[PDB]
């Protein structure tokens, strides 16, 4: 048996080896919605007990004997194994979005517990274990969550670019008057994007129905694209900003928003406001095409 601090080092290592495995995982007509969430919670509590136990113990001297450490390490692994096992009990059946969140929480826990084991060898885990009650328990709430995560991301991008522009002086690495002028539409387009996600969230909130696992997953899937579009768009705005690239990215975003809106209109979630959001969006893009025509002329 190795050193106690050495033994933990290996526990940590052995722990991270799971992350890849948990990312991709095997998984039912008889599925206990409530019995599931009960077991997972317990799983979590147990995990954090072990974290606490190890923490208090390896905080003081002398350290435990090598065999004592061996037991501790096992308890930790057992607690982790048991938790993952519960995760693996959740059927894709219940929602891809739902499963992603449980999966991510599961990984967070595993990774946290690994971080701590390293640290002890020389509060991610506890926080991670705290999360259990918070995480959604049906694909509707999961979708809602995912949607607000998007709204927020877009909102920040907006703010960043806006501050960015403001601070711009009242050669390269600069913004031209032309650059400045073309930024205006791009920014509204981003704002319209947020407007879109918020509209979608709202409709899902008001009309979404837990049963519609597939459609919820659908609306979420396309919704998620809005953010990287925006991200790509923003990144090309900053200098040196190629107008050609801005035009392309803008068009990508538009196509996305529209695809998002279209999928929402067909879902069980539909009502209107969508047509005039599309008016705003078209006007932005039209304005962007116009500010940028000389690039695509010959």
Swiss-Prot record:
Function: May negatively regulate cell cycle progression. May act at least in part via inhibition of the cyclin-D1/CDK4 complex, thereby preventing phosphorylation of RB1 and blocking E2F-dependent transcription.
Nucleus among keywords: yes
Signal peptide stretch: none
GO cellular component terms listed in the entry, alphabetical order: cytoplasm; nuclear body; nucleoplasm; nucleus
Pfam assignment, any one: GCIP_C
Main location: cytoplasm
Family in the record: Belongs to the CCNDBP1 family.
Region (Interaction with TCF3): 1-154, 123-298
InterPro entries: GCIP-like (IPR026907), GCIP-like_N (IPR049317), GCIP_C (IPR049318)
Protein's name in the database: Cyclin-D1-binding protein 1
Annotated region described as Required for interaction with CCND1, given as residue ranges: 1-170
Tissues where this protein is expressed: Ubiquitously expressed. Expression is down-regulated in a variety of tumor types including breast, colon, prostate and rectal tumors, and is up-regulated in certain hepatic carcinomas.
Inducers of expression: Expression is induced by sodium butyrate, an inhibitor of colon cancer cell proliferation.
Localization (cell): Cytoplasm; Nucleus
SUBUNIT field: Interacts with CCND1 and GRAP2. May also interact with COPS5, RPLP0, SIRT6, SYF2 and TCF3.
Nucleus as UniProt keyword: yes
PTM annotation: Phosphorylated.
Keyword set, alphabetical order: Acetylation, Cell cycle, Cytoplasm, Nucleus, Phosphoprotein
Region named Interaction with RPLP0: 1-160, 182-298
């Amino acid at each position: 048996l190795a050193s106690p601090l050495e033994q933990l080092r290996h526990l940590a290592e052995e722990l991270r080896l799971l992350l890849p495995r948990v990312r991709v995982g095997e998984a039912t007509e008889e599925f206990n919605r409530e019995m599931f969430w009960r077991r997972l919670n317990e799983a979590a509590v147990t995990v954090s007990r072990e974290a606490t136990t190890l923490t208090i113990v390896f905080s003081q001297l002398p350290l435990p004997s090598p065999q004592e450490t061996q037991k501790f390490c096992e308890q930790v692994h057992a607690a982790i194994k048991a938790f993952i096992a519960v995760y693996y009990l959740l059927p894709k059946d219940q929602g891809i979005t739902l499963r992603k969140l449980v999966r991510g929480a599961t990984l967070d826990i595993v990774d946290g517990m690994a971080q701590l084991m390293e640290v002890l060898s020389v509060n991610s885990v506890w926080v991670a274990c705290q999360q259990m009650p918070q995480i959604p328990r049906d694909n509707k709430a999961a979708a809602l969550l995912m949607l607000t995560k998007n709204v927020d991301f877009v909102k920040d991008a907006h703010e960043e670019m806006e501050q960015a522009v403001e601070e711009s002086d009242p050669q390269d690495l600069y913004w031209s008057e032309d650059d400045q002028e073309l930024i205006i539409p791009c920014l509204a387009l981003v704002r319209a994007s947020k407007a879109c996600l918020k509209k979608i969230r709202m409709l899902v909130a008001e009309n979404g129905k837990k049963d519609q696992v597939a459609q919820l997953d659908d609306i979420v899937d396309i919704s998620d694209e809005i953010s990287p579009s925006v991200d790509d768009l923003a990144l090309s705005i900053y200098p040196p900003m190629s107008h050609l690239t801005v035009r392309i990215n803008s068009a990508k975003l538009v196509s996305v928003l529209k695809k998002a809106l279209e999928i929402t209109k067909a879902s069980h979630v539909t009502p209107s406001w969508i047509p005039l959001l599309i008016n705003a969006i078209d006007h932005c893009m039209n304005r962007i095409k116009e500010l940028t025509q000389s690039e695509l002329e010959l």
